[PDB]
């Protein structure tokens, strides 16, 4: 039910690839093979929190297109 | 004249994508600088501790030579006292 | 015809993005490798600091063994000379 | 000299756009890296690699000039 889960639901639904890259705050870069493609980031106190912050920023961007 | 709405829209979406992406690039640049620095740091720390360990091994060997001399001295003293007891 | 302009704008933004993403790419690859590098050095530092701690303990054992030898030699000598003076 | 880096600066003074170099040493990497930013419209973030900071800077400058001409 998390942000990450929404984005993955969305990528499975609209057929674009989503790749998380985690960096030890924690940093997550999330790449989206959309048109045009997106590269978002998120930070957090854990890999999970940063991944969901990234996913959230991706969902915001996707909605603004 | 409708083509201008779609023009300005596409432009808007590319501008958004670019802004977002540049913010990511900035984050990446800072993180790469810091990580590279850390690699330098841990590399230097590693040499520092290997060198310190090396000085410590030499101290150990010097003290070991000290102790070796002492053992021979003690043994000769023992041989003297015990030979004298036997006489 | 506003569409020549549309497709041109699209073209220049596509070039800009493609280029920029190539930059993002080299930043990410280098940052990944740097991070791996840092973990490796972290682990190596740990092993050598362990080894140094161990050696420091050994030095303390050898140092104690040496003072024990000095006291034993002093006492042994005192004994040998007391028995020499007795005889 | 007369270099790539000099041509780009000529161009930035001429056309009033900002250009910023960022250099990364070889370190434990396979080469030197330079990122160069161009405050153009749309802005550009180019890079260059080399066996020296000088080389990576010229490679970057060159990358920047190619992209500017292709627009």
Numbering used by the authors:
A (entry chain H): 949 to 972, 978 to 1018
B (entry chain C): 502 to 588
C (entry chain A): 503 to 589
D (entry chain F): 948 to 1018
Sentences from the paper on this structure:
Mira is a key adaptor protein that directs several cell fate determinants to basal cortex during the asymmetric division of Drosophila NB. Mira is a multi-domain scaffold protein that concentrates at the basal cortex along with its cargos during mitosis of Drosophila NB asymmetric division. The Stau family of dsRNA-binding proteins exerts a conserved function in mRNA transport, localization and translational control from Drosophila to mammals. However, both dsRBDs 2 and 5 are required for the anchoring of bicoid mRNA, whereas dsRBD5 also directs the actin-dependent localization of pros mRNA through interaction with Mira, pointing to other functional roles of dsRBDs 2 and 5 rather than RNA binding.
The complex structure was solved by single-wavelength anomalous dispersion using Se–Met derivatives at 2.5 Å resolution. The structure revealed that the complex forms a 2:2 heterotetrameric architecture, in which two Stau dsRBD5s interact symmetrically with the N-terminal end of the Mira coiled-coil homodimer. In accord with the previous small-angle X-ray scattering-based structure prediction, two Mira514–595 fragments, each made up of a single contiguous α-helix, dimerize in a parallel manner to form an elongated ‘rod-like' structure. Interestingly, the Mira coiled-coil dimer is slightly asymmetric, with one curved helix A wrapping around the other approximately straight one A′. The interesting feature of the Mira514–595/Stau dsRBD5 complex structure is that Stau dsRBD5 binds to Mira through the exposed face of its β-sheet, a mode that has never been observed in any other dsRBDs before this study. Hydrophobic residues, such as Tyr971Stau on β1, Leu980Stau and Ile982Stau on β2, Ile992Stau and Val996Stau on β3 of dsRBD5, Ile528Mira and Leu529Mira from helix A, and Val526′Mira, Met530′Mira, and Leu533′Mira from helix A′ form the hydrophobic core at the interface. Arg532Mira from helix A forms an extensive hydrogen bond network with the side chain of His976Stau, and main chain carbonyls of Pro972Stau and Glu978Stau at L2 of dsRBD5. In agreement with the solved crystal structure, SEC and ITC experiments showed that mutations on Mira (L529E, M530E and R532A) or Stau (Y971K, H994E and I982A) from the Mira–Stau packing interface disrupted or severely impaired the interaction between Mira514–595 and dsRBD5. In line with the complex structure, L557EMira mutation was also found to disrupt the Mira–Stau interaction, demonstrating that the dimer assembly of Mira CBD is crucial for Stau dsRBD5 binding.
